[PDB]
Chains A and B, each alone.
Chain A
Amino acid sequence: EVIPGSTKDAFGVAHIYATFNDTFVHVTDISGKETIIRITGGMRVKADRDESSPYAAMTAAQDVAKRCKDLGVTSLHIKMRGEGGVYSKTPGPGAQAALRALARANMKIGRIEDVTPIPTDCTKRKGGRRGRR
């Protein structure tokens, strides 16, 4: 019958955090303290260079949606984010693919947002004066 813990169609929030080396799809409850399912792009691949690939992002996104609907979560809020502490604030290539995969899995997206942490003022960046060479 009903999977224990599931309820009527409710709202979840998906924390899509895709850097250039991986991608995280992580849905939590409205309070954000309880997590429904957390799948990363590195669990759906073999090599270490494909963890940020768009295919690994949608594959992890479909598995998130399948568990969410089965657990009663039918509509999601999106919080897009990249590694933006002091590094490049641009989200990785798999973040968009994961967001599109959630939509194509018949999920009702709510409010989308970019929550990359923009520093009011930064600590010293890695690399030195002359930077990556």
Chain B
Amino acid sequence: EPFSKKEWYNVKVPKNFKRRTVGQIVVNKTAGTRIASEQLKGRVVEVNLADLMENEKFGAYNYKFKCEDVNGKDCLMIFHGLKLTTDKLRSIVKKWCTLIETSVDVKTTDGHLIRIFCIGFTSRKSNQIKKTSYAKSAQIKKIRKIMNNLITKEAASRELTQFVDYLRENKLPKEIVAKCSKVFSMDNVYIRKVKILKAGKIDSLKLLDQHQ
């Protein structure tokens, strides 16, 4: 029997989310020199945002977490990254517009080095009659420069935990559209992916503050 040596651990996300438990993961029982709590020190868990916040309006994003230490049958997950759902990313790429992309390496105030990817699209106006809405190379560079600089200021002041919660608020995509509409009519602005280029140092006290 394969599952005779298997035991399940409860998965606990940090307190920033409405839902605290997201599921159970499996691991073989302890052995000679194979400690189960050691073999769970790097597992990565992909969780939708809709489940975390218990609202289906947040279903466009997928979040990722990493098990750092075992608190007696419990992992204490930490935020590993985020990524747009595949169906949403391909549904926002219209044809007769201009696609604008960017990426910034931002050093969060608490020491995390992260890479943030932003995507945007030129839109059609209310009275517009012509089929195509393209932007010159000059307007595109202005727009990318605006969203490069504006996203850096928002993420450089706040630490990683609060910045991710700041992403849940639609202020940044709304601010970018409002600021970039002075250069060209923009409608769709999303932050499609965030990585962790260099993990900032963390302490068991810091994890405790992040877990109740």
With a CB–CB cut-off of 8 A, which chain B residues contact A3?
Answer: 3
- Residues of A15-49 contacting chain B, CB below 8 A: 29-34, 36
Interface window among A6-14, A54-62, A91-99, A101-109: A6-14
Instruction: Give A77 Cβ to nearest chain B Cβ, in Å.
Output: 9
A86 within 8 A of B: no
- Report chain A residues within 8 Å CB of B6: 4-5, 34
Task: Kindly list chain B residues whose C-beta atoms are within 8 Å of the C-beta of A129.
Answer: none
Question: Which chain A positions have C-beta within 8 A of B23?
Answer: 10-11, 29-30
Assembled-state Cα–Cα distance A6/B2 (Å):
11
Question: Chain A contacts of B50 at CB under 8 A?
Answer: 111
Q: Which residue of A lies closest to B7 (CB)?
A: A5
B11 touches A30 (CB 8 A): yes
Q: Which stretch of B38-46, B132-140, B142-150, B156-164 is in the interface?
A: B38-46
For residue A64, CB closer than 8 A to chain B, the reply is no
- In the complex the two chains form, is A7's CB within 8 Å of B3's CB? no
Chain A residues near B59 (CB-CB < 8 A): 111
Q: Which of B24-32, B109-117, B168-176, B203-211 contacts A (4 or more CB under 8 A)?
A: B24-32
- Kindly list chain A residues whose C-beta atoms are within 8 Å of the C-beta of B24: 7, 10-11, 29-30
Find A5's partner among B4, B48, B85 (CB 8 Å cutoff): B4
In the assembly, what is the distance between CA of A5 and CA of B8, in Å? 8
Interface bits B170-193 vs A (CB < 8 Å: 1, else 0): 000000000000000000000000
Contact present for A114 and B3 (CB under 8 Å) = no
The yes or no answer to A121 lying at the interface (CB within 8 A) is no
B46 touches which of A7, A32, A34, A114 (Cβ 8 Å): A32
Closest to B26 in A: A34
- Chain B residues lying within 8 Å of A6, measured Cβ to Cβ, are 3
Q: With A7-B24, A30-B11, A30-B22 in contact, do A113 and B85 touch (Cβ < 8 Å)?
A: yes
CA distance A114 to B91 in the complex (A): 13
- Chain A, residue nearest B50 (CB): A111
Task: Give A71 to B8 CA distance when docked, in angstroms.
Answer: 12
B165 CB–A CB distance under 8 Å: no
| B45 in contact with A30 (CB, 8 Å) | yes
A91 and B50 alpha carbons, distance in the complex (Å): 27
Chain A residues with a Cβ under 8 A of chain B: 3-7, 10-11, 29-34, 36, 71, 111, 113-115
Which A-B residue pairs are the 4 nearest by beta carbons?
A5-B3, A5-B6, A34-B26, A30-B23
Q: Footprint of A on B, CB under 8 Å?
A: 1-8, 11, 22-27, 43-48, 50, 59, 67, 85-87
7 sample A-B contacts, Cβ–Cβ < 8 Å, listed by A number: A6-B3, A29-B23, A31-B45, A33-B25, A33-B43, A36-B26, A114-B87
